[PDB]
Amino acid sequence: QMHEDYCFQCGDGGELVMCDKKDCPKAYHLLCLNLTQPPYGKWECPWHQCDECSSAAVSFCEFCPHSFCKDHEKGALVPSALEGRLCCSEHDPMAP
Amino acid sequence: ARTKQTARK
Ligand SMILES: [Zn+2]
Ligand SMILES: [Zn+2]
Ligand SMILES: [Zn+2]
Ligand SMILES: [Zn+2]
């Protein structure tokens, strides 16, 4: 399984916990998850949960863990200047 | 969950 060597939340390296969701490459500082110790056993990272509701996410910010279910995707993501990678409202689409 | 230690920018 491939994972990034930098935290998806803050962008820096260090002690990172890795997502167990199939094919998810995301890794995170515990601090950046608002956790004080690694989750025990199989763990799915915050990218798989909708920002707006309790449903699983299906549409993803490519620059941070924000993501959205089918009911919340419209208008929550826009194609960025970086190869059309989708970004949430927290990034300048011209320089994500 | 598994952890690793990488270089910190
Ligand atoms: Zn972090
Ligand atoms: Zn994940
Ligand atoms: Zn939702
Ligand atoms: Zn984002």
Tab-separated table of N, CA and C and ligand atoms in Angstrom:
chain	number	residue	atom	x	y	z
A	1	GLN	N	0.848	-1.225	0.000
A	1	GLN	CA	0.000	0.000	0.000
A	1	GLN	C	0.867	1.251	0.000
A	2	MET	N	0.571	2.189	-0.902
A	2	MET	CA	1.337	3.463	-0.980
A	2	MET	C	0.730	4.530	-0.093
A	3	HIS	N	1.575	5.251	0.654
A	3	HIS	CA	1.145	6.441	1.358
A	3	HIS	C	2.105	7.568	1.185
A	4	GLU	N	1.559	8.781	1.173
A	4	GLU	CA	2.326	10.023	1.207
A	4	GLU	C	3.217	10.104	2.446
A	5	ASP	N	4.285	10.895	2.332
A	5	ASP	CA	5.244	11.085	3.420
A	5	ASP	C	5.088	12.433	4.134
A	6	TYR	N	3.939	13.068	3.915
A	6	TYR	CA	3.618	14.358	4.499
A	6	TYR	C	2.180	14.301	4.957
A	7	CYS	N	1.855	15.074	5.987
A	7	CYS	CA	0.498	15.145	6.520
A	7	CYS	C	-0.428	15.866	5.554
A	8	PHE	N	-1.565	15.245	5.256
A	8	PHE	CA	-2.547	15.838	4.338
A	8	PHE	C	-3.195	17.104	4.915
A	9	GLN	N	-3.166	17.250	6.240
A	9	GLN	CA	-3.809	18.411	6.872
A	9	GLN	C	-2.930	19.650	6.848
A	10	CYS	N	-1.660	19.489	7.218
A	10	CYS	CA	-0.770	20.646	7.376
A	10	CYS	C	0.411	20.692	6.399
A	11	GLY	N	0.657	19.586	5.694
A	11	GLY	CA	1.696	19.532	4.661
A	11	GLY	C	3.102	19.140	5.091
A	12	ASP	N	3.331	18.965	6.391
A	12	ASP	CA	4.682	18.663	6.864
A	12	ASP	C	4.867	17.200	7.218
A	13	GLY	N	6.124	16.768	7.226
A	13	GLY	CA	6.475	15.407	7.600
A	13	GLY	C	6.522	15.267	9.112
A	14	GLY	N	6.991	14.119	9.581
A	14	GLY	CA	7.024	13.856	11.019
A	14	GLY	C	6.411	12.509	11.321
A	15	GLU	N	5.797	12.386	12.496
A	15	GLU	CA	5.155	11.136	12.893
A	15	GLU	C	3.776	11.124	12.263
A	16	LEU	N	3.544	10.183	11.349
A	16	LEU	CA	2.304	10.165	10.574
A	16	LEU	C	1.586	8.847	10.743
A	17	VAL	N	0.270	8.928	10.912
A	17	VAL	CA	-0.573	7.748	10.901
A	17	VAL	C	-1.212	7.618	9.525
A	18	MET	N	-1.272	6.382	9.046
A	18	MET	CA	-1.654	6.099	7.689
A	18	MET	C	-3.060	5.527	7.574
A	19	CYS	N	-3.779	5.966	6.542
A	19	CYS	CA	-5.151	5.513	6.305
A	19	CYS	C	-5.197	4.056	5.849
A	20	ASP	N	-6.136	3.280	6.402
A	20	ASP	CA	-6.316	1.876	6.006
A	20	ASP	C	-7.347	1.633	4.905
A	21	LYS	N	-8.079	2.673	4.499
A	21	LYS	CA	-9.049	2.551	3.393
A	21	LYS	C	-8.307	2.119	2.121
A	22	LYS	N	-8.860	1.151	1.380
A	22	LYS	CA	-8.181	0.596	0.193
A	22	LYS	C	-7.795	1.708	-0.747
A	23	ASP	N	-6.495	1.744	-1.091
A	23	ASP	CA	-5.930	2.707	-2.040
A	23	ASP	C	-5.862	4.159	-1.581
A	24	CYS	N	-6.212	4.439	-0.320
A	24	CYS	CA	-6.064	5.797	0.173
A	24	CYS	C	-4.610	6.059	0.583
A	25	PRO	N	-3.979	7.102	0.007
A	25	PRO	CA	-2.555	7.316	0.300
A	25	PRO	C	-2.334	8.321	1.412
A	26	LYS	N	-3.411	8.747	2.063
A	26	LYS	CA	-3.274	9.877	2.996
A	26	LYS	C	-2.698	9.474	4.351
A	27	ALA	N	-1.916	10.389	4.919
A	27	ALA	CA	-1.239	10.182	6.210
A	27	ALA	C	-1.324	11.492	7.000
A	28	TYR	N	-1.332	11.411	8.331
A	28	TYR	CA	-1.660	12.567	9.173
A	28	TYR	C	-0.874	12.587	10.478
A	29	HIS	N	-0.487	13.777	10.937
A	29	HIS	CA	-0.082	13.941	12.349
A	29	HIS	C	-1.244	13.661	13.241
A	30	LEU	N	-0.987	13.047	14.385
A	30	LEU	CA	-2.049	12.846	15.361
A	30	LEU	C	-2.669	14.171	15.808
A	31	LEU	N	-1.807	15.144	16.116
A	31	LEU	CA	-2.212	16.515	16.456
A	31	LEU	C	-3.203	17.078	15.427
A	32	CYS	N	-2.970	16.780	14.151
A	32	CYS	CA	-3.764	17.374	13.078
A	32	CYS	C	-5.129	16.723	12.901
A	33	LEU	N	-5.325	15.610	13.596
A	33	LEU	CA	-6.581	14.886	13.634
A	33	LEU	C	-7.305	15.215	14.926
A	34	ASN	N	-6.648	16.017	15.761
A	34	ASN	CA	-7.104	16.312	17.119
A	34	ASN	C	-7.160	15.028	17.944
A	35	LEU	N	-6.103	14.228	17.793
A	35	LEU	CA	-5.914	12.982	18.525
A	35	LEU	C	-4.614	13.051	19.313
A	36	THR	N	-4.537	12.270	20.387
A	36	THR	CA	-3.373	12.271	21.275
A	36	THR	C	-2.605	10.945	21.219
A	37	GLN	N	-3.153	9.981	20.483
A	37	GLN	CA	-2.540	8.657	20.289
A	37	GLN	C	-3.073	8.035	18.994
A	38	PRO	N	-2.315	7.106	18.372
A	38	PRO	CA	-2.861	6.522	17.139
A	38	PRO	C	-4.161	5.755	17.376
A	39	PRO	N	-5.085	5.806	16.398
A	39	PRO	CA	-6.279	4.960	16.458
A	39	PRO	C	-5.856	3.490	16.493
A	40	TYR	N	-6.605	2.662	17.221
A	40	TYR	CA	-6.294	1.238	17.320
A	40	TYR	C	-6.957	0.451	16.203
A	41	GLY	N	-6.203	-0.471	15.609
A	41	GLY	CA	-6.721	-1.295	14.526
A	41	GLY	C	-7.016	-0.542	13.241
A	42	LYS	N	-7.875	-1.135	12.414
A	42	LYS	CA	-8.158	-0.601	11.074
A	42	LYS	C	-8.852	0.741	11.201
A	43	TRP	N	-8.359	1.721	10.452
A	43	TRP	CA	-8.746	3.124	10.590
A	43	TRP	C	-8.881	3.788	9.251
A	44	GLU	N	-10.043	4.398	9.024
A	44	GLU	CA	-10.313	5.227	7.843
A	44	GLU	C	-10.197	6.705	8.208
A	45	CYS	N	-9.449	7.430	7.383
A	45	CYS	CA	-9.108	8.814	7.655
A	45	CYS	C	-10.302	9.747	7.386
A	46	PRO	N	-10.186	11.034	7.770
A	46	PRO	CA	-11.332	11.959	7.650
A	46	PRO	C	-11.747	12.274	6.202
A	47	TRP	N	-10.896	11.958	5.223
A	47	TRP	CA	-11.268	12.201	3.824
A	47	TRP	C	-12.514	11.438	3.403
A	48	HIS	N	-12.837	10.359	4.113
A	48	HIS	CA	-13.971	9.518	3.707
A	48	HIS	C	-15.270	9.899	4.378
A	49	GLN	N	-15.261	10.952	5.186
A	49	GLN	CA	-16.532	11.423	5.785
A	49	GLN	C	-16.932	12.809	5.299
A	50	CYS	N	-18.200	12.961	4.908
A	50	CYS	CA	-18.721	14.254	4.465
A	50	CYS	C	-18.466	15.322	5.518
A	51	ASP	N	-18.110	16.507	5.034
A	51	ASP	CA	-17.962	17.701	5.856
A	51	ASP	C	-19.290	18.165	6.429
A	52	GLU	N	-20.356	17.985	5.651
A	52	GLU	CA	-21.653	18.607	5.952
A	52	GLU	C	-22.657	17.682	6.639
A	53	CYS	N	-22.482	16.369	6.485
A	53	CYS	CA	-23.412	15.409	7.087
A	53	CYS	C	-22.719	14.110	7.494
A	54	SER	N	-23.491	13.200	8.077
A	54	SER	CA	-22.941	11.946	8.590
A	54	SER	C	-22.614	10.914	7.495
A	55	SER	N	-22.984	11.200	6.240
A	55	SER	CA	-22.787	10.247	5.139
A	55	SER	C	-21.321	10.195	4.716
A	56	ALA	N	-20.933	9.062	4.125
A	56	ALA	CA	-19.613	8.866	3.546
A	56	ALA	C	-19.353	9.854	2.413
A	57	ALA	N	-18.105	10.300	2.276
A	57	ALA	CA	-17.784	11.225	1.186
A	57	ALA	C	-17.546	10.474	-0.110
A	58	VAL	N	-17.949	11.093	-1.222
A	58	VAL	CA	-17.716	10.545	-2.568
A	58	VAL	C	-17.011	11.528	-3.501
A	59	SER	N	-16.891	12.781	-3.071
A	59	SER	CA	-16.230	13.827	-3.843
A	59	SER	C	-15.239	14.546	-2.957
A	60	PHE	N	-14.007	14.716	-3.455
A	60	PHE	CA	-12.865	15.002	-2.595
A	60	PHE	C	-12.108	16.273	-2.937
A	61	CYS	N	-11.835	17.096	-1.916
A	61	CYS	CA	-10.825	18.145	-2.084
A	61	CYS	C	-9.493	17.437	-2.274
A	62	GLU	N	-8.722	17.886	-3.260
A	62	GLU	CA	-7.418	17.265	-3.530
A	62	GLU	C	-6.253	17.904	-2.770
A	63	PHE	N	-6.572	18.889	-1.933
A	63	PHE	CA	-5.577	19.700	-1.245
A	63	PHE	C	-5.688	19.683	0.281
A	64	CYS	N	-6.781	19.126	0.793
A	64	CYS	CA	-6.958	18.960	2.231
A	64	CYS	C	-8.059	17.924	2.441
A	65	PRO	N	-8.283	17.484	3.701
A	65	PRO	CA	-9.261	16.419	3.952
A	65	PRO	C	-10.744	16.758	3.748
A	66	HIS	N	-11.086	18.004	3.405
A	66	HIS	CA	-12.493	18.322	3.124
A	66	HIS	C	-13.004	17.469	1.996
A	67	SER	N	-14.228	16.984	2.150
A	67	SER	CA	-14.851	16.114	1.147
A	67	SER	C	-16.337	16.048	1.441
A	68	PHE	N	-17.100	15.481	0.510
A	68	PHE	CA	-18.541	15.675	0.439
A	68	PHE	C	-19.256	14.466	-0.139
A	69	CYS	N	-20.437	14.189	0.394
A	69	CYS	CA	-21.317	13.168	-0.165
A	69	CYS	C	-22.028	13.701	-1.411
A	70	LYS	N	-22.843	12.845	-2.035
A	70	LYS	CA	-23.554	13.205	-3.262
A	70	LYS	C	-24.467	14.426	-3.077
A	71	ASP	N	-25.101	14.525	-1.911
A	71	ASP	CA	-26.016	15.632	-1.618
A	71	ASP	C	-25.306	16.967	-1.347
A	72	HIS	N	-24.021	16.904	-1.008
A	72	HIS	CA	-23.263	18.110	-0.651
A	72	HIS	C	-22.149	18.519	-1.587
A	73	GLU	N	-21.966	17.765	-2.659
A	73	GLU	CA	-20.881	18.034	-3.595
A	73	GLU	C	-21.087	19.287	-4.454
A	74	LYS	N	-22.324	19.532	-4.901
A	74	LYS	CA	-22.580	20.636	-5.830
A	74	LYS	C	-22.194	21.972	-5.186
A	75	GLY	N	-21.306	22.690	-5.871
A	75	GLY	CA	-20.816	23.981	-5.416
A	75	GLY	C	-19.787	23.949	-4.297
A	76	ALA	N	-19.441	22.756	-3.805
A	76	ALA	CA	-18.490	22.618	-2.690
A	76	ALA	C	-17.056	22.419	-3.179
A	77	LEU	N	-16.924	22.120	-4.463
A	77	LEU	CA	-15.629	21.852	-5.070
A	77	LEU	C	-15.589	22.502	-6.434
A	78	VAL	N	-14.428	23.022	-6.800
A	78	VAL	CA	-14.249	23.599	-8.122
A	78	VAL	C	-12.939	23.087	-8.705
A	79	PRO	N	-12.862	22.965	-10.039
A	79	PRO	CA	-11.591	22.594	-10.672
A	79	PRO	C	-10.575	23.722	-10.487
A	80	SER	N	-9.384	23.372	-10.003
A	80	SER	CA	-8.326	24.351	-9.763
A	80	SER	C	-7.434	24.501	-10.995
A	81	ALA	N	-6.567	25.510	-10.959
A	81	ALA	CA	-5.593	25.744	-12.023
A	81	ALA	C	-4.534	24.637	-12.114
A	82	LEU	N	-4.481	23.779	-11.098
A	82	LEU	CA	-3.499	22.702	-11.057
A	82	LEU	C	-4.084	21.440	-11.679
A	83	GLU	N	-4.032	21.374	-13.011
A	83	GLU	CA	-4.543	20.224	-13.777
A	83	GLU	C	-6.023	19.904	-13.519
A	84	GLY	N	-6.800	20.903	-13.103
A	84	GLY	CA	-8.212	20.712	-12.769
A	84	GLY	C	-8.473	19.905	-11.505
A	85	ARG	N	-7.446	19.699	-10.679
A	85	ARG	CA	-7.645	19.025	-9.401
A	85	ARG	C	-8.679	19.821	-8.608
A	86	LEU	N	-9.639	19.119	-8.011
A	86	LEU	CA	-10.736	19.800	-7.328
A	86	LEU	C	-10.256	20.384	-6.001
A	87	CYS	N	-10.727	21.585	-5.668
A	87	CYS	CA	-10.385	22.173	-4.374
A	87	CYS	C	-11.635	22.701	-3.694
A	88	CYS	N	-11.665	22.596	-2.365
A	88	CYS	CA	-12.740	23.168	-1.559
A	88	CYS	C	-12.540	24.673	-1.428
A	89	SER	N	-13.437	25.303	-0.672
A	89	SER	CA	-13.478	26.753	-0.527
A	89	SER	C	-12.258	27.325	0.187
A	90	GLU	N	-11.442	26.456	0.792
A	90	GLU	CA	-10.302	26.910	1.589
A	90	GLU	C	-9.005	27.115	0.806
A	91	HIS	N	-9.084	27.036	-0.520
A	91	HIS	CA	-7.906	27.236	-1.388
A	91	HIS	C	-8.247	28.186	-2.484
A	92	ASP	N	-7.281	29.021	-2.847
A	92	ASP	CA	-7.369	29.852	-4.035
A	92	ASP	C	-7.345	28.913	-5.254
A	93	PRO	N	-8.448	28.858	-6.033
A	93	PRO	CA	-8.450	27.962	-7.197
A	93	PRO	C	-7.332	28.272	-8.199
A	94	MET	N	-6.806	29.490	-8.162
A	94	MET	CA	-5.728	29.887	-9.065
A	94	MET	C	-4.349	29.480	-8.557
A	95	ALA	N	-4.267	29.149	-7.267
A	95	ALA	CA	-3.004	28.787	-6.620
A	95	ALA	C	-3.305	27.957	-5.381
A	96	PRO	N	-3.788	26.724	-5.585
A	96	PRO	CA	-4.208	25.861	-4.484
A	96	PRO	C	-3.016	25.236	-3.769
B	1	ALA	N	-4.101	1.345	13.602
B	1	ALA	CA	-3.516	2.015	12.395
B	1	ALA	C	-1.995	2.052	12.481
B	2	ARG	N	-1.328	1.997	11.326
B	2	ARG	CA	0.141	1.982	11.273
B	2	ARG	C	0.700	3.404	11.221
B	3	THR	N	1.880	3.602	11.806
B	3	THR	CA	2.547	4.892	11.740
B	3	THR	C	3.919	4.754	11.108
B	4	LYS	N	4.466	5.885	10.668
B	4	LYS	CA	5.846	5.964	10.183
B	4	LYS	C	6.414	7.327	10.594
B	5	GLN	N	7.730	7.486	10.475
B	5	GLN	CA	8.373	8.741	10.817
B	5	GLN	C	9.116	9.250	9.594
B	6	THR	N	8.751	10.451	9.153
B	6	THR	CA	9.349	11.060	7.972
B	6	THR	C	9.979	12.401	8.355
B	7	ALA	N	10.810	12.925	7.459
B	7	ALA	CA	11.532	14.180	7.681
B	7	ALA	C	10.574	15.364	7.712
B	8	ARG	N	10.785	16.267	8.670
B	8	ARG	CA	9.893	17.411	8.882
B	8	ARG	C	10.440	18.716	8.281
B	9	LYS	N	9.871	19.108	7.133
B	9	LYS	CA	10.192	20.358	6.418
B	9	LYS	C	10.435	21.531	7.360
C	1	ZN	ZN	-0.160	17.760	10.187
C	2	ZN	ZN	-8.088	7.783	3.723
C	3	ZN	ZN	-23.119	15.183	3.100
C	4	ZN	ZN	-9.533	21.642	0.771
